[PDB]
Amino acid sequence: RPTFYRQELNKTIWEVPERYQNLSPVGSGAYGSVCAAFDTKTGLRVAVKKLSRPFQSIIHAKRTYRELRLLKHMKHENVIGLLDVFTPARSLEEFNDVYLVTHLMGADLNNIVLTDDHVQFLIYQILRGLKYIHSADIIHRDLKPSNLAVNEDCELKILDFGLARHTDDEMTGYVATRWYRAPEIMLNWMHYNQTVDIWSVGCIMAELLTGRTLFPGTDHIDQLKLILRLVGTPGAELLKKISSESARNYIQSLTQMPKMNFANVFIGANPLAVDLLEKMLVLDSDKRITAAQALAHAYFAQYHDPDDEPVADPYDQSFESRDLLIDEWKSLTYDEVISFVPPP
Numbered sequence: 073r074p075t076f077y078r079q080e081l082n083k084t085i086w087e088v089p090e091r092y093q094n095l096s097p098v099g100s101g102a103y104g105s106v107c108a109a110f111d112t113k114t115g116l117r118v119a120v121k122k123l124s125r126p127f128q129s130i131i132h133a134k135r136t137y138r139e140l141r142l143l144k145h146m147k148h149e150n151v152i153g154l155l156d157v158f159t160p161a162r163s164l165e166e167f168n169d170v171y172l173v174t175h176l177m178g179a180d181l182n183n184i185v186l187t188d189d190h191v192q193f194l195i196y197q198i199l200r201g202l203k204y205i206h207s208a209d210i211i212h213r214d215l216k217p218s219n220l221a222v223n224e225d226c227e228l229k230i231l232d233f234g235l236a237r238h239t240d241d242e243m244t245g246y247v248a249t250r251w252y253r254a255p256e257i258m259l260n261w262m263h264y265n266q267t268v269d270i271w272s273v274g275c276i277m278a279e280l281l282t283g284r285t286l287f288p289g290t291d292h293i294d295q296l297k298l299i300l301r302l303v304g305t306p307g308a309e310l311l312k313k314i315s316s317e318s319a320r321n322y323i324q325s326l327t328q329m330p331k332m333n334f335a336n337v338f339i340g341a342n343p344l345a346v347d348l349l350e351k352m353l354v355l356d357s358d359k360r361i362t363a364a365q366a367l368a369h370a371y372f373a374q375y376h377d378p379d380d381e382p383v384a385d386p387y388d389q390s391f392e393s394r395d396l397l398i399d400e401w402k403s404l405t406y407d408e409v410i411s412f413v414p415p416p
């Protein structure tokens with residue numbers, strides 16, 4: 073057990089191991105708060121998160137567990153790594169606070185939105201990380217430029233796993249929180265697959281190429297109209313797959329429109345980018361290209377290496393369908409804190 077010291081920071085007492093020095097507030101929110109620090113043990117600039125209300129309710133305790141399990145599992149260059157997790161508690165009985173540690177990220181994909189080779193390299197890396205997380209049945213569900221961290225050398229990591237679900241109010245109106253979302257999840261059409269994330273990649277790739285939001289809807293309905301103008305109204309085949317009678321019935325109220333010519337939308341773009349976009353931005357999620365198929369697409373020929381695109385270890389998420397009491401989720405979280413072993 074290391075020695076901890078105490079410090080008042082963004083209104084709470086932070087108690088962290090001495091190895092972590094120069095804590096400075098960088099962020100705050102209902103999730104808790106984040107400080108930058110220097111980890112003297114590794115030489116790394118880290119983000120240290122102190123969870124707020126980790127075990128306040130069943131849903132909170134389970135979410136804290138879910139985040140720790142997810143972050144502990146991620147062992148990939150294009151995905152956030154867990155550097156450390158700790159608590160000042162010496163036993164389960166006195167366990168209350170959880171701190172999570174990862175690499176301090178600076179620039180995101182927003183503070184970057186480029187040449188075609190840049191776009192290649194960035195989208196290549198997203199798909200690389202997606203192949204990895206999808207191979208473990210982990211779906212991101214919320215990919216947007218703001219959780220794609222990029223360094224000076226254009227190296228990319230996907231962030232944001234097991235975070236608190238967005239509220240209805242947060243998804244309302246002219247907001248980037250919804251612009252990258254696949255229509256099936258935006259309108260709750262059906263059970264959604266791993267390729268919800270591929271739809272988001274298409275949106276982000278289009279934005280990298282053009283400098284502009286692809287579907288900047290002023291609300292859910294306006295956004296769907298923007299989507300259907302590009303990719304065409306659904307055929308009978310996908311209509312049957314929308315399990316909500318309400319949604320399907322509404323979709324049917326709309327004037328039929330054909331899929332547009334993507335070369336006429338993405339003017340001047342590499343024809344291979346255009347082809348990839350057409351294969352990612354398919355309305356029927358059963359027909360969308362997957363991460364693994366996309367990595368093999370000619371657009372990425374300069375970066376594609378089938379021997380350097382690893383898959384993940386099996387990820388047991390049986391806990392997701394488990395009902396437990398607050399104290400049970402907390403004990404499982406404890407066990408996970410205690411069993412953590414740092415990366416090399």
Ligand SMILES: On1c(-c2ccncc2)c(-c2ccc(F)cc2)c2ncccc21
Nearest residue numbers: 099103106119121172173174175176177
């Ligand atoms: O910005 N930010 C961050 C963050 C990450 C990296 N650099 C700056 C902030 C995290 C985070 C910090 C440490 C972890 F182990 C996991 C997530 C985070 N979590 C919730 C909400 C916002 C967050």
